[PDB]
Amino acid sequence: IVGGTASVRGEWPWQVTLHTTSPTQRHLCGGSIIGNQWILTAAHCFYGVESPKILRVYSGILNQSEIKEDTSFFGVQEIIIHDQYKMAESGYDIALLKLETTVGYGDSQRPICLPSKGDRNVIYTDCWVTGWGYRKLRDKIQNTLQKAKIPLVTNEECQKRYRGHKITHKMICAGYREGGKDACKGDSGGPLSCKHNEVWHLVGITSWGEGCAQRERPGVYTNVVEYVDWILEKTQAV
Numbered sequence: 001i002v003g004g005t006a007s008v009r010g011e012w013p014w015q016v017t018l019h020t021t022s023p024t025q026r027h028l029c030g031g032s033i034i035g036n037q038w039i040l041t042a043a044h045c046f047y048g049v050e051s052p053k054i055l056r057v058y059s060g061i062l063n064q065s066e067i068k069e070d071t072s073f074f075g076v077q078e079i080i081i082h083d084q085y086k087m088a089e090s091g092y093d094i095a096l097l098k099l100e101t102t103v104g105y106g107d108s109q110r111p112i113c114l115p116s117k118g119d120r121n122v123i124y125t126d127c128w129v130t131g132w133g134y135r136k137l138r139d140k141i142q143n144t145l146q147k148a149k150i151p152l153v154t155n156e157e158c159q160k161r162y163r164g165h166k167i168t169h170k171m172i173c174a175g176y177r178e179g180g181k182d183a184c185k186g187d188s189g190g191p192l193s194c195k196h197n198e199v200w201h202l203v204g205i206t207s208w209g210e211g212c213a214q215r216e217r218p219g220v221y222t223n224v225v226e227y228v229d230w231i232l233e234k235t236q237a238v
């Protein structure tokens, strides 16, 4: 996160750190608890991931230093990537991780509500991008979960900013015209959380941008409202 501040413990209890084990263990991406056995993340996070056997999901984490060999995690049973996904810049940058075990809900780990279909018309004014990513382009993964309040941007205004790209309605952008606050390397997969009627909703999944927090370069996010039916299709399968 660029231009953010340290989160407080329990502030984003749906936030998870998705770690890879091959060749050595390291943070890979962010993610959101959306069900007791479901993590919603970005499809691009699995580039060169041969099996879910190398993945470890950590919930209830504020500081990456909380993770050692004795720290408990959730194994990943299945990786479900949207089958229209080619690359982040083309959209469909959404994936579901089905966990081997059930998440025990408490004040340190709980699900974020998905946006309602009737909430496609609502205008969110309190949105936050969270993660353990870089504070600038050439940096390192942060120990403490960072947060940044970012304004939502119209598809039209985002399309002006990304000439040469096709910004679809399945994408949602966020950022200040002058930059300064944004997601960066290590944040992808994580949430873009918006508070509405005292209820947090998963509006976006951190996807891509040209650089980090640049003037007139909004962060591009997967527009979760547009994938509610795809999420239910995979999580509610008979």
Ligand SMILES: CC[C@@H]1CCC[C@H](NC(=O)/C=C/c2cc(Cl)ccc2-n2cnnn2)c2nc(c[nH]2)-c2ccc(NC(=O)OC)cc2NC1=O
Residues within 6 Å of the ligand: 026, 027, 028, 029, 044, 045, 046, 047, 133, 137, 140, 141, 182, 183, 184, 185, 186, 187, 188, 206, 207, 208, 209, 210, 211, 212, 213, 218, 219, 220, 221
């Ligand atoms: C499959 C491989 C995965 C995802 C690749 C894409 C991802 N993009 C992002 O995380 C965010 C992009 C982005 C998103 C928005 Cl919304 C706006 C502006 C953005 N950026 C544009 N240029 N940089 N960031 C990214 N993550 C890292 C570098 N780049 C990264 C850095 C460090 C570690 N681990 C580490 O040091 O452990 C000790 C792990 C990763 N993970 C990855 O390599």
